[PDB]
Amino acid sequence: PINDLRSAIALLQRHPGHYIETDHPVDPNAELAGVYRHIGAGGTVKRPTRTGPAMMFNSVKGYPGSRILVGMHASRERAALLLGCVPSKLAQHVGQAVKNPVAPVVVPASQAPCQEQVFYADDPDFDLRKLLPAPTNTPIDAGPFFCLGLVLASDPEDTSLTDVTIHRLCVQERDELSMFLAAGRHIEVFRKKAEAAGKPLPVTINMGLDPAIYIGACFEAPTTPFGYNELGVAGALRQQPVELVQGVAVKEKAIARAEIIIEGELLPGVRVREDQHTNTGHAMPEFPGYCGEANPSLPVIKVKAVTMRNHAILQTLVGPGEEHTTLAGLPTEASIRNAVEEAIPGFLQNVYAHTAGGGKFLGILQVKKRQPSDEGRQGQAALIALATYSELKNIILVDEDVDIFDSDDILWAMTTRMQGDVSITTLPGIRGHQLDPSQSPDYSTSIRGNGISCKTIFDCTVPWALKARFERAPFMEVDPTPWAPELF
Amino acid sequence: PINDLRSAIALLQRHPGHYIETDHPVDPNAELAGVYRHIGAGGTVKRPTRTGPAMMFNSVKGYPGSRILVGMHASRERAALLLGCVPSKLAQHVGQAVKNPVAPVVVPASQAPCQEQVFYADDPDFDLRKLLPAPTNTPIDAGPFFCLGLVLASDPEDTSLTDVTIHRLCVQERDELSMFLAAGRHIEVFRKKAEAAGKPLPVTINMGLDPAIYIGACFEAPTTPFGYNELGVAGALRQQPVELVQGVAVKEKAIARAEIIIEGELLPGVRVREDQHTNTGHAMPEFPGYCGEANPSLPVIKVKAVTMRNHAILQTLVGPGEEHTTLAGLPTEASIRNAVEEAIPGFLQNVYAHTAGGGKFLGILQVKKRQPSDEGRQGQAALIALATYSELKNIILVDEDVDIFDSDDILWAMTTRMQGDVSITTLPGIRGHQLDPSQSPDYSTSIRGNGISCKTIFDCTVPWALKARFERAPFMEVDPTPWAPELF
Ligand SMILES: Cc1cc2c3c(c1C)C(C)(C)CC=[N+]3c1c([nH]c(=O)[nH]c1=O)N2C[C@H](O)[C@H](O)[C@H](O)COP(=O)(O)O
Ligand SMILES: Cc1cc2c3c(c1C)C(C)(C)CC=[N+]3c1c([nH]c(=O)[nH]c1=O)N2C[C@H](O)[C@H](O)[C@H](O)COP(=O)(O)O
Ligand SMILES: [Mn+2]
Ligand SMILES: [Mn+2]
Ligand code: NA
Ligand code: NA
C-alpha cells in the first residue's frame, strides 16, 4: 500500500535494480547531477547516459542529515511498478484515471507527517539556502533549483477551484524563490487575478510525494481544462483521495504526507531576473536536451515557513531526462489514446510519447488495420494526435507487429515499411513549442516565428492491400528456459 | 591469439555473458532457432528478441556427438572483442584492413585440423543429411539449411583469382546441396563460365571459422572488386595469413583451420527447385526480417567429400538477425568510412550500418562541421555513402554529439535537429535491393520494378550558422564509480 514517497521506496527495494543508496559525499552544486547523469538520468541527456535505479544520496556536502533523492520517475518500468500495471498499459491505465478523478480530502494536522518539523521564516536566523540543499543541474544554471516542486494554488475569487502544477523554482534569497510560468499556465490565471487586485496569492510547494501525485498532475488542456483539480488523477491511480493539510502559515492547503513543504505567497508587482546572482544567462536544462535561457522577469515567492518530516528527503530530478519523459509522456499518451478511441474505436492499439521527444515532441502510434476501410485511418489517427496535443512535432505510425517502445524496431519500420516520396506528409507553419531550437525562422523560411514548426507524419504502416507480403518471419514458439535456466 | 573458431570461443569464455552451453536436447529442425530467438537472435527478428551470448547446443536430437553453435557474431560488442578493438572504432579498424590485405598461404595437411576426419561421398553409407545437422530457421523453410557456409571458388581460366562468399545452402539429397547465387555475385561469374563450357566448378564450403574470416568476406565491389580475394581482409585483421589446404576430393583449396568442410562441384546444366521436398513456397528468413520465397531454379553442388575436425562444431546462425547485421554491417561501415575519408579527410567521425536495416539498408553518418565550408558537405558524405554501397536505402546525418549507436539518440536528432520541409531529400527510382518488400511498383508509382527504391537523406546536423544555439546541456565531468561501484 503506497501512500507517500517512503512507501514507494519500500516497494522499489522489493524489486532489485530500481533503488540504490550511496554514503559517498556529494556536492549538490552540479556534482550530484553529474553523477546521476551516468547512472540513471536517461532521456534527452547528452550521452553517456542510461536509465537505471532511483538514487538516494545520503551524505550531502554541507548538509549533514539531509538526503537527496533523484530518478524516482526516471524509468517507464519503475513508474509501472509504482502504479501497479505493466508498462505497455500505462497509456490505458493513466487514460482511465484522468477520466475518473477522485477528489482530495482534508485532514487534521495530527495526521500530517509533513509538519513534524516547522521552521518559520520570521525567525531571524532562518535561511532557506542553508536549510535545504537545492541542487543545480549544470555549472551554468541560474542558481539552486527545486525541480519537483508541486505548487498548489487556487482562484482568489473562487476558493473552490484549485490547480497543482510542477514549476521550476530557483532559490534567490534567504526567504525568496523565483518561479517561471509559461504563457497561459493555469496557475498564472490565478496569480494575474491576484496581481491585478494588488494582492498576493498564497501558495504551497509540496516536494517528495507519492509518484502517483506527480504523474497525475502533468496533464494539459483540453484533457484537463481550466478548473480541473489535477489532484484526483492521483486519487484515481491509488483509488484513494490524497490527503491535505491546512498550511501552518498561509491561507492554503498542503499535501499532508509530503516530505517537505514550503509555504509562501506570490508577491504582486515584484519581478526578478532569474540569473541575478549568477549572470550565466541560463535557467536550467529543458526537456528537449538544451539549456534554457534565464528568464528576465519572474514572479517571486516570499517564504513564510518551511515544514518537513523528520529526516526529510529532498526529492528532485536530473536531466530532466527520462524523469520528465515519464511525468509529461504518460499524460500525453493518455490524452491521445482517449481521443483516438473516442473517434475511431478499436483502431489504436497503443501510443508512446517517445523519450527522444521528452514525452512531448514525438508520438509513436501503433494501429491495427482490421478491414479494407481502415486504410486511410492511420493518417486520421495522426491528425487526432496532433489536434489533441498541439506541442507534438512528429508522428510515426506503425502496425501492431512493431514494438513501439523499441527504437530499433521503430527505425526498422521506417526502413522496410516506408517510401520517402509516399509515406511522408509535411505540415508547415503549425505552432509547436518554444523550446525546440529548430522551430525558428533561421531554420526554415516557412517558419514565421519562434515556436512554429513544420510537423511531419511518417506513415510506416503496411498498405492494407500489401499486408500478406509484410508478415514478419515466424519462429517456432518454444519455452527457452530449459536450455538457459539462469537466464530466466 | 585467435586463428580459428575455438581460439575465438576461448576468448569469449574470459568475458562472461558472451558464451554459454547447454546439454538439454534440441531439435535442429525449427526448435533450435526458436530457442535462440529468445536468447540472442536480435536484429530484425520478430519480437520478443534480444542480443545475448553465443550459444552452443551440445545435445542435438538425431545427431549424437554433434554440437551446433549459433550467435558467434550476433553482438557488436562481441565482434569488437573478437577483432581486438573498441566497438565504436570498428569502421576505422575494418576499413584499414581492407585497404592493406594480407594474402593467404597454402599449408600441408599436417597443419590442417579441418582434415582430421575424411568422409568420402562415394561410400554407399554416406549421407550428408545424417552426417551433419543442418538447422532450419522457421517451420516453413525450404529444407535443412547451412547459413554460415563460406564458399571458396576460383576462376576456371585463372586459378590465381579466388573469391570467397557466404551463400545459403539447402540440403537436397544424400550428396547434393542447392546454392543460391544472386546476379552479379563474383563466384557466379566463375560458375557461369564453367557451365558455359559444360564443366563443373569445384567449390569448398568452409564452416566454423575465425570470426575475422566471416566478417572480412562480406565486402562487395567497388570496395573489394572482382579479383580481390576477401581472405586478405581476414589476414590483415589478424596480421597473419589465412592458411589454405588442398581438398581431398576436389581441385580447390579449403580453409585449413576450419571446423567442417564440404567439398563439391557445381554441376553444369542441372537446376533444382529449392523447396522440392517440402513445397512450403519459402526459402528461409531474410535479413530485412521477412520470409523469402523459395527459388524455383538453383544450381546444385554435388558433394564429393566432407572433411571435419574431431568433435567438430557446426556453426550457423538464427534470424539471421544481429548476426547478419555484424557480418554485412561492419564491411558496409568500413567501405563507407574509407570512401568518405578519401574524399573529405577529417570530416566523417563514424558510421553505423544500423541493425534496423540488417547492416545494409540504413546508414547513420556522424560528421563534424569544423568550419563554414563544411556546411553542405554533410549531404556530400551521404552521396558518397550511397555511391559506395548501392544497397543502402536511407541515410541519417548527425553531428559528433549524437551517439549513432543509440537509436533513442538518433530519433532525438530527428526530432530537435530536423525540419521536415527543409532536412529531407528524396531520390526516386534508384536501384536498391530485391528483399526490401516496399521496393515494389505496388508501393509507389515512382518505382518501375522490384528492388528499385526512393532513397531518402535525413539531414539531422545542426546548420553551421546555428551551432552555438544547439549545444546539449553540459553536465559536470565526474567519475561516477565511487557512488556506485557495483554498477561499474
Ligand atoms: C514535468 C515538468 C513540467 C514542467 C517543468 C518541469 C517539469 C519536470 C521542470 C521543473 C523540470 C522545468 C520546468 N517546468 C515548467 C513547466 N511549466 C512551466 O510553466 N514552467 C516550468 O518551469 N512544466 C510544464 C508543466 O508543468 C506542464 O505542462 C503542466 O501540464 C501544466 O499544467 P497546467 O495546464 O495546469 O498549467
Ligand atoms: C552475411 C550473409 C550474406 C549473404 C547470405 C547470408 C549471409 C548470412 C545468408 C546465408 C544468411 C543467406 C544469404 N546469403 C547469400 C548472400 N549472397 C547470395 O548471393 N546468396 C545468398 O544466399 N549473401 C550476401 C553475400 O554474402 C554478400 O553480398 C557478399 O558480400 C557478396 O560477395 P561477392 O561480391 O564476392 O559475391
Ligand atoms: Mn491544469
Ligand atoms: Mn568478391
Ligand atoms: Na496543473
Ligand atoms: Na565474396
Author numbering:
A (entry chain B), B (entry chain A): 4 to 491
From the study:
Based on a literature survey and a preliminary activity screen of heterologously expressed potential para‐carboxylases, 3,4‐dihydroxybenzoic acid decarboxylases from Enterobacter cloacae (EcAroY) and Klebsiella pneumoniae (KpAroY, 89 % identical) were selected for further studies.2d, 13 Both enzymes belong to the UbiD family and are related to a ferulic acid decarboxylase (Fdc1), which has been shown to facilitate the (de)carboxylation of cinnamic acids in the presence of a recently discovered prenylated flavin (prFMN) cofactor. The AroY monomer consists of an N‐terminal prFMN‐binding domain (residues 1–339), an oligomerization domain (residues 340–475), and a C‐terminal α‐helix (residues 476–495). A comparison with the previously reported structures of the fungal Fdc1 and E. coli UbiD14 shows that AroY structures adopt an “open” conformation, where the position of the prFMN domain is more akin to that observed for UbiD, compared to the more closed conformation observed for Fdc1. Crystal structures and in vitro reconstitution data unambiguously demonstrate that prFMN is employed as a cofactor, and that oxidative maturation is required for activity.
Upon in vitro reconstitution with reduced prFMN,14a, 15 decarboxylation activity could be detected with 3,4‐dihydroxybenzoic acid (3,4‐DHBA, 1) following brief exposure to oxygen to generate the active prFMNiminium form. The lack of activity for anaerobically reconstituted protein clearly demonstrates the requirement for oxidative maturation of the prFMN cofactor. The active site of AroY is clearly defined by the prenylated isoalloxazine moiety of the cofactor and the presence of key conserved residues. It is situated near the hinge point of the prFMN‐binding domain motion, and at the cleft between the oligomerization and the prFMN‐binding domains. Two water molecules are clearly defined in the active site; one of them forms hydrogen bonds to His327 and Lys363 while the other one interacts with Lys363, His436, and Arg188. We hypothesize that the two water molecules mimic the two hydroxy groups at the meta‐ and para‐positions of the substrate protocatechuic acid. Given the relative rigidity of the substrate, we superimposed a catechol moiety onto the two water molecules, and the carboxylate moiety was positioned in close proximity to the prFMN iminium group. In Fdc1, the substrate α‐carbon atom adjacent to the carboxyl group is located directly above the prFMN C1′ atom whereas in AroY, the α‐carbon atom is located above the isoalloxazine N5 atom. Owing to the preference of AroY for catechols over simple phenols, a second hydroxy group seems to be mandatory for ideal substrate positioning (with a hydrogen bond between OH and His327) in the active site of the enzyme. The carboxylate group, on the other hand, is bound near the conserved Glu‐Arg‐Glu/Asp triad of ionic residues, which is located near the prFMN N5=C1′ iminium moiety.
